[PDB]
Design a protein around this ligand. Structure first.
Ligand SMILES: CN(Cc1cc[n+]([C@@H]2O[C@H](COP(=O)(O)OP(=O)(O)OC[C@H]3O[C@@H](n4cnc5c(N)ncnc54)[C@H](O)[C@@H]3O)[C@@H](O)[C@H]2O)cc1)C(=O)NCC(F)(F)F
Ligand SMILES: CN(Cc1cc[n+]([C@@H]2O[C@H](COP(=O)(O)OP(=O)(O)OC[C@H]3O[C@@H](n4cnc5c(N)ncnc54)[C@H](O)[C@@H]3O)[C@@H](O)[C@H]2O)cc1)C(=O)NCC(F)(F)F
Lengths: 140, 140
């Protein structure tokens, strides 16, 4: 059972998500990121259960990271699905701000607008060690 | 004197560059990346000195990473200057390919066209530990 689930957008946050994985593992956290721990079987249910199983939900807000969520009322976008799962399970949600533009809440589906109300950590290229230390402080 | 200099484009390669720095330090290499080791003074001289001092030159070829080098015949662009320094000192150049598209040599200044002749390592999001192990194989 991993302590941390990392949710990210492949086309914009793959590298930061991987970097967060390495640091958090070095600090003793078990981390789920799909390319390392999503294994055999039907992945829709495996992903959902992995979010449920992890106490902490680290959300990589790269630029445009929530764009595919907009108008996704059928909840088929995977970042959307992961966030809704994290919200519904009362997870400790820790957004990571990396060039993200804060959208007006009303452009997002109602079931995930609450993600914007969580306190986010700004990724600092110049102060990465301090960013990591702060992320660790936010984890449970 | 760091063993490895990491050259990269801030606007497309910062995360991979830091990811590479973390991994290489975990495997025992001293690494120069500007946000961690570029300290006080005139940075023109310090950057060039740091390239000259490092046996290995790890070049992060994110998408469009050499765009600003094109037509930079006065050699004002910083990745251009770092590459020319690495080529001039005969450093072990190790390009890391991350969605980079191979240009025709002639679009680049003649003093850095040689960089394309170096065997580059494909960055694999799904096989990152294998990518890293290949990179450590390339370093001296
Ligand atoms: C299952 N899967 C898709 C997926 C996994 C996790 N997510 C979560 O959702 C966020 C990313 O969301 P994002 O929107 O950025 O990704 P998509 O562009 O939607 O994915 C579409 C791309 O996956 C490939 N694709 C489609 N179908 C399969 C398939 N049956 N098998 C293998 N690849 C498949 C296509 O070739 C597209 O190129 C993260 O937080 C993740 O946790 C979203 C999607 C994989 O990748 N498995 C490989 C690994 F296990 F290593 F991850
Ligand atoms: C000195 N410097 C600029 C620089 C350093 C290294 N490189 C190498 O060259 C590649 C990157 O090339 P790239 O084209 O991506 O860089 P630019 O985006 O053009 O930089 C322009 C931006 O730097 C900032 N900028 C300008 N002037 C100064 C100044 N006097 N002081 C602090 N910031 C300055 C503005 O905010 C611009 O917005 C890498 O391989 C690096 O090794 C290029 C440029 C810093 O950063 N110092 C901070 C730290 F030490 F933490 F790095």
């Amino acid at each position: 059972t991993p302590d941390v689930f990392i949710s990210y957008r492949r086309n914009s946050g793959s590298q930061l998500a991987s970097l967060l994985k390495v640091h958090l593992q070095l600090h003793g956290f078990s981390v789920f990121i799909d390319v390392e721990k999503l294994e055999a079987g039907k992945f829709e249910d495996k992903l959902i259960q992995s979010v449920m199983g992890a106490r902490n939900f680290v959300l990589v807000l790269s630029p445009g990271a929530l764009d595919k969520c907009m108008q996704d009322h059928d909840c088929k976008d995977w970042v959307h699905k992961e966030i809704v799962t994290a919200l519904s399970c009362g997870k400790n949600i820790v957004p990571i701000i990396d060039g993200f533009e804060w959208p007006e809440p009303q452009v997002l589906p109602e079931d995930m607008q609450a993600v914007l109300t969580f306190n986010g950590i700004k990724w600092s290229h110049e102060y990465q060690e301090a960013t990591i230390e702060k992320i660790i402080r936010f984890l449970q």
